[PDB]
Amino acid sequence: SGAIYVGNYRVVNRHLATHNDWANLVWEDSSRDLLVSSTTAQGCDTIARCDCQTGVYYCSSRRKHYPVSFSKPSLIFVEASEYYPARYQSHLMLAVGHSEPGDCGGILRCQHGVVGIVSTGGNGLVGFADVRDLLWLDE
Ligand SMILES: COc1ccccc1[C@H](NC(=O)OC(C)(C)C)C(=O)N1CCC[C@H](C(N)=O)C1
Ligand SMILES: [Zn+2]
């Protein structure tokens, strides 16, 4: 679990969005596993606007942060789950790092700000949904 809070927006994994997120929907994209909802309070986070390929992510299943080298956002095949059919997930970055069911929502950060959130994983891999291209989150 986890979310990014920037301005009057809350960014979460679309498969973990609540009834309240959907009732305050701003934008969602199933192909990216992202959903953004509106908030009444001002958020605590800031978004990176960069091309970093290194950073640090929070791993809830270890209560620890780990450094990672990750691939640029791209279209990556993701196996079926209860949440989605087998499909290509877009804007996904992969890295070698621990993740397991329940780690979605952990933030990946570089020196410039928030890069994205955990969205997939498996067998010593961790995948992050990028948010750096969502320029409108900043206004
Ligand atoms: C962080 O996700 C990890 C990490 C390691 C191993 C497995 C997983 C997840 N698998 C998982 O939860 O499987 C269950 C439901 C328990 C059968 C995973 O990769 N998902 C599930 C949630 C939706 C994700 C997506 N963006 O399509 C893909
Ligand atoms: Zn950066």
Curated annotation (Swiss-Prot):
Residue sites binding Zn(2+) 1 per the record: C50, C52, C110, H112
Substrates-to-products reaction catalysed: Selective cleavage of Tyr-|-Gly bond in the picornavirus polyprotein
Residues in the signal sequence: none
Active site: H15 (for protease 2a activity), D33 (for protease 2a activity), C104 (for protease 2a activity)
Transmembrane segments: none
Function: Cysteine protease that cleaves viral polyprotein and specific host proteins. It is responsible for the autocatalytic cleavage between the P1 and P2 regions, which is the first cleavage occurring in the polyprotein. Also cleaves the host translation initiation factor EIF4G1, in order to shut down the capped cellular mRNA translation. Inhibits the host nucleus-cytoplasm protein and RNA trafficking by cleaving host members of the nuclear pores. Counteracts stress granule formation probably by antagonizing its assembly or promoting its dissassembly.
Assembly mode: Homodimer.
Record protein name field: Protease 2A
